[PDB]
Amino acid sequence: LGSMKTERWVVREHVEGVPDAARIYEKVETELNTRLGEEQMLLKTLYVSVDPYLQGICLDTPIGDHMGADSIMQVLDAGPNAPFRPGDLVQGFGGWRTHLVSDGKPKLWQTGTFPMVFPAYRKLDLRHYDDALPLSTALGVMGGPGMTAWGTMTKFMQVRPGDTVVVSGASGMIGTLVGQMAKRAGARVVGTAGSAGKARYLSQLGFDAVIDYKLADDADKMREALREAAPDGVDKYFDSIGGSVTDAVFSMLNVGSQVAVCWQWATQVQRDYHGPRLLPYIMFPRATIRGIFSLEWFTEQNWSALHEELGGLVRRQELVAHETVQDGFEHIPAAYQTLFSASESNRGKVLVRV
Amino acid sequence: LGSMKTERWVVREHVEGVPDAARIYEKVETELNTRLGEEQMLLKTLYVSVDPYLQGICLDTPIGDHMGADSIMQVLDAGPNAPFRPGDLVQGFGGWRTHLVSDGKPKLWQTGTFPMVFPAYRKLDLRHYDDALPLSTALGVMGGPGMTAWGTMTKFMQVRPGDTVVVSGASGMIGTLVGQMAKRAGARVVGTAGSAGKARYLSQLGFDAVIDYKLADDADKMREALREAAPDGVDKYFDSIGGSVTDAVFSMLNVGSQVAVCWQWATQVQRDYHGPRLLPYIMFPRATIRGIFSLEWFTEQNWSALHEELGGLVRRQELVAHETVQDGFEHIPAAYQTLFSASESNRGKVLVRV
Ligand SMILES: NC(=O)c1ccc[n+]([C@@H]2O[C@H](COP(=O)([O-])OP(=O)(O)OC[C@H]3O[C@@H](n4cnc5c(N)ncnc54)[C@H](OP(=O)(O)O)[C@@H]3O)[C@@H](O)[C@H]2O)c1
Numbered sequence: 001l002g003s004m005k006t007e008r009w010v011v012r013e014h015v016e017g018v019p020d021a022a023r024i025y026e027k028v029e030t031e032l033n034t035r036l037g038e039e040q041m042l043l044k045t046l047y048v049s050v051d052p053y054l055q056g057i058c059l060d061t062p063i064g065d066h067m068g069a070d071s072i073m074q075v076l077d078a079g080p081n082a083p084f085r086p087g088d089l090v091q092g093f094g095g096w097r098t099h100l101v102s103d104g105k106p107k108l109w110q111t112g113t114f115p116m117v118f119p120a121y122r123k124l125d126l127r128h129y130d131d132a133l134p135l136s137t138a139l140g141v142m143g144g145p146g147m148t149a150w151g152t153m154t155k156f157m158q159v160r161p162g163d164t165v166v167v168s169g170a171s172g173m174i175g176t177l178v179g180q181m182a183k184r185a186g187a188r189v190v191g192t193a194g195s196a197g198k199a200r201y202l203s204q205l206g207f208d209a210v211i212d213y214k215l216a217d218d219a220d221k222m223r224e225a226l227r228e229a230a231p232d233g234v235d236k237y238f239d240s241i242g243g244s245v246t247d248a249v250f251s252m253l254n255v256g257s258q259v260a261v262c263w264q265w266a267t268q269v270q271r272d273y274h275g276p277r278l279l280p281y282i283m284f285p286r287a288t289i290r291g292i293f294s295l296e297w298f299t300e301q302n303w304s305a306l307h308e309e310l311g312g313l314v315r316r317q318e319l320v321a322h323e324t325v326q327d328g329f330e331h332i333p334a335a336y337q338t339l340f341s342a343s344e345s346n347r348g349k350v351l352v353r354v
Numbered sequence: 355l356g357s358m359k360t361e362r363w364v365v366r367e368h369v370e371g372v373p374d375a376a377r378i379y380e381k382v383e384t385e386l387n388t389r390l391g392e393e394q395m396l397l398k399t400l401y402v403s404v405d406p407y408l409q410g411i412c413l414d415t416p417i418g419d420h421m422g423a424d425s426i427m428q429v430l431d432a433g434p435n436a437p438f439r440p441g442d443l444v445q446g447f448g449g450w451r452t453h454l455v456s457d458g459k460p461k462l463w464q465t466g467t468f469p470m471v472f473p474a475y476r477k478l479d480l481r482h483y484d485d486a487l488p489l490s491t492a493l494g495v496m497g498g499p500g501m502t503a504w505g506t507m508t509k510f511m512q513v514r515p516g517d518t519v520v521v522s523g524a525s526g527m528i529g530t531l532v533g534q535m536a537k538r539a540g541a542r543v544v545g546t547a548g549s550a551g552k553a554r555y556l557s558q559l560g561f562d563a564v565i566d567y568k569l570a571d572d573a574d575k576m577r578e579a580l581r582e583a584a585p586d587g588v589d590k591y592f593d594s595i596g597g598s599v600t601d602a603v604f605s606m607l608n609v610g611s612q613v614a615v616c617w618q619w620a621t622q623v624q625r626d627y628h629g630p631r632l633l634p635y636i637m638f639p640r641a642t643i644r645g646i647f648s649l650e651w652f653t654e655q656n657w658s659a660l661h662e663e664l665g666g667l668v669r670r671q672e673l674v675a676h677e678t679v680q681d682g683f684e685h686i687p688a689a690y691q692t693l694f695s696a697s698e699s700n701r702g703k704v705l706v707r708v
C-alpha cells in the first residue's frame with residue numbers, strides 16, 4: 001500500500017570518549033515502508049531528546065543503524081490492533097528519525113552491554129500542558145529526566161532536614177531537580193559545576209555550595225573543596241559523574257547515608273576505568289549505595305504522581321525546570337555536541353523540535 | 355590494700371600485611387589494682403576470640419597497650435552499684451588479658467579510623483546454653499559473628515527461592531552461617547575457598563559450588579570460575595574478601611540484586627586498594643549495596659531473637675556452627691596466627707580457652 005521518504009541520523013563511526021558529532025553521525029534519506037502490521041502504526045517525530053547517556057547507546061548501536069533517543073511522536077496512521085489511534089501524541093524511544101513504524105511494545109536492546117528492554121510507548125493527554133508547562137516537558141521535567149529525579153527522592157532517598165546532600169553534575173536538569181527537592185526537604189545542598197557561569201546559575205537555584213570540578217583536577221584537591229563545602233559530612237550523594245569526585249565523597253560518608261548512582265560520566269565519557277576501591281569506606285557508616293535505572297518506574301500511577309506532585313511546583317515557580325529547545329531536524333547532532341562543550345549555554349534539558 | 359598479678363598480651367610493634375604474631379605481641383606481667391569503685395567490676399577472662407579484623411585494631415592500638423578482643427569474662431568482684439554481681443558471666447571487648455577492671459560501659463575507640471563505640475558488656479544467662487550450643491557460642495554463632503550473619507539475612511537480604519547467593523570467605527563462621535541460611539531460603543549457594551580442605555568443608559554444609567580463589571589470583575580466571583558456578587547471574591553477594599573476586603561478582607549482577615559488604619580481607623590484609631570501578635555495574639541491575647557494621651544490632655531484643663531464631667536451628671541439627679577452641683592463654687597469638695596461615699587446618703570460629 002505505499003512507502004514514504006524519511007530522514008534518519010544513522011551511526012557512521014564508533015568513537016570512544018567525548019564524541020565528535022559530525023564524525024559519528026550522518027543524515028541519510030531512507031525509504032520507509034508504510035504497510036502497517038496488525039498492531040503497527042506510522043509515527044511522526046515532533047521532538048527528540050539529546051542526552052549524554054546516548055554516548056553509550058551509540059557505541060552499542062550497529063554501524064549504519066539509526067540513533068536511539070527519547071522522542072515525542074504523533075500517530076499518523078494506525079493498524080487495526082494498535083495501542084493508539086491517529087492523532088494521539090505518544091512518548092517512546094523513537095530515535096533520531098523523522099518517521100518510523102512501530103508496534104509500540106517493549107523492544108529489547110539486544111546489542112547492549114546489559115540486556116535492556118525499552119519501555120512501551122505512553123500516551124500524552126494534551127490537557128496537561130500549556131505555556132508554563134509545555135508539551136516538551138514530556139522529554140524533561142514531565143518525562144525521563146523528571147521521573148529519574150522525582151523517583152530517587154520519593155522511592156529511595158529520605159532527606160531529613162539537616163542532612164547535607166551532594167549532587168554531581170548538578171547543573172543539568174536531573175541534578176538541579178534533585179538538589180532543589182533536597183533544599184525543599186531541609187537539606188544543605190552541595191553541587192558541582194564546570195564554569196563560573198554554571199556555578200552562579202546553580203547558586204540562584206539555591207545550592208549552598210558549588211565546587212569547580214575542573215579547578216579541582218586532583219582527587220585530593222577535590223576532597224578538600226568537599227571537606228569545607230560539607231563540613232559535617234555527606235548524608236545523601238546523587239552521583240552522575242563518578243571518577244575522582246565520588247572517590248572524594250565516599251571518603252566522608254556519614255552514618256546511615258545513601259548514595260544513588262545514576263550515571264558515571266567520568267568512566268563512560270572520560271574513561272576513568274581504574275581507581276581506589278570505594279567499598280571499604282561503606283562498612284562502618286552502613287552506607288546504602290543504590291543504582292538508578294529509572295525505566296523501572298515508567299508506570300501509569302508514577303506518571304500521574306509526577307504530574308500532580310511535581311508539575312504543580314513547576315507551574316507555580318516553586319521549582320525551576322529549564323529547557324533549551326533548538327529547532328530543526330538537521331541540527332540534532334549539533335545540539336547533542338553542546339552537551340560536551342564547556343560553554344555555559346545550557347540550562348536544563350536540551351531538545352530539538354522538528 | 356588490694357592488688358593482683360595479671361598477664362597481658364601487649365602490642366610490641368606495628369607490622370603491616372599478614373601479621374607476625376610472635377613478633378607483634380608480647381606476654382607481660384601486670385599488677386592490677388583491685389580496689390574497685392562503687393560501680394566498677396573485677397573480671398576474669400574465660401575465653402578470648404581471635405579474629406582477622408584484629409589486624410586492623412592492632413595497627414590502631416597504641417604501642418605497649420593491650421590487644422583488644424571479644425572475650426567471655428566472669429565477675430570476680432563488683433562494687434555496690436556495678437551493673438553485674440559476682441559470679442555473673444558477661445561478654446564484651448575485654449581483650450587478650452587474664453584479669454581486668456571495667457565499669458562495663460560503652461567505651462569509645464578514639465584511636466580509630468572511624469570513631470567507634472564499643473558496646474557495654476552484656477550479661478550471659480546460662481539457661482541459653484547447653485551441650486550443643488555451649489557457653490563459648492557467645493563469641494560465635496551466639497555472639498558477634500552469628501549476629502552479623504543473622505542480622506544481614508533478616509534485616510537486609512531477602513533471598514527468594516531460586517536466587518544464586520555468592521558468599522566470599524565462605525569457609526569462616528560468618529560465611530558458612532550466611533550460606534546455610536541462603537541455602538535454607540531456597541538459594542543456589544556459591545562460596546570461595548583456598549584449598550580442597552576448605553572447599554570440601556564447604557562442600558559439606560551444602561554449598562552447591564566452591565571456587566578456588568587461590569587458583570585465580572588473576573581476575574580473568576576468576577570471572578570465568580564465577581560464570582561457571584553462577585550460570586544465571588548473581589542475585590545476592592555476601593562479601594568478606596573484596597579484591598578481584600568482588601570485581602568478578604559485580605560483572606554479573608542480576609536485576610534487583612543485593613550486595614552486603616562485610617569486610618575486605620584483600621584491602622585490610624593484602625592491601626588491594628585499587629581496582630576497576632564497580633559503581634558502573636550497579637546501575638542497570640538496580641543493585642542495592644549496603645555496608646555491614648553489626649554493632650548497630652547489639653540490642654537486647656536482637657539478642658533474644660538470635661537465640662530464638664538461630665539457636666533453635668543449631669540445636670535441631672539444621673545448622674552446623676563449628677568452632678576450633680585452642681587452649682592456653684600463652685597460645686593466643688599462636689591461635690591468632692592460624693587465621694592467616696596458608697594451611698587451612700581450622701574450621702568454624704577460632705577461640706582460646708583461658
Ligand atoms: N539511570 C537512568 O535511568 C538515567 C536516566 C536519564 C539520564 N541518565 C543520565 O544521568 C545523568 C544525569 O542527568 P543530568 O540531566 O544531570 O545530565 P547533565 O547534568 O547534563 O550531566 C552532565 C553534567 O555534568 C557535569 N560534568 C560533565 N563532565 C564532568 C566531569 N568530567 N566531572 C565532573 N562533572 C562533569 C557538567 O556540568 P557543567 O555544565 O558545569 O559542565 C554537565 O552539565 C545524565 O548524564 C544522563 O545521561 C540516567
Ligand SMILES: NC(=O)c1ccc[n+]([C@@H]2O[C@H](COP(=O)([O-])OP(=O)(O)OC[C@H]3O[C@@H](n4cnc5c(N)ncnc54)[C@H](OP(=O)(O)O)[C@@H]3O)[C@@H](O)[C@H]2O)c1
Pocket residue numbers: 283405406407408498499502522523524525526527528529530546547548549552567594595616617619620624646647648649697698703
Ligand atoms: N562488619 C562487621 O561488623 C564484622 C563483624 C565481625 C567480623 N567481621 C569480619 O568479617 C569476616 C568474616 O567473619 P568470619 O568469622 O567468618 O571470618 P573468616 O571467614 O575466617 O574471614 C576470612 C576467611 O576468608 C578466607 N580467606 C582468607 N584469605 C583469603 C583471600 N586472600 N581470598 C579469599 N578468601 C580468603 C579464609 O578461608 P581459607 O581457609 O579458605 O583461607 C577465612 O576463613 C571476618 O574476617 C571479620 O574480620 C566484620
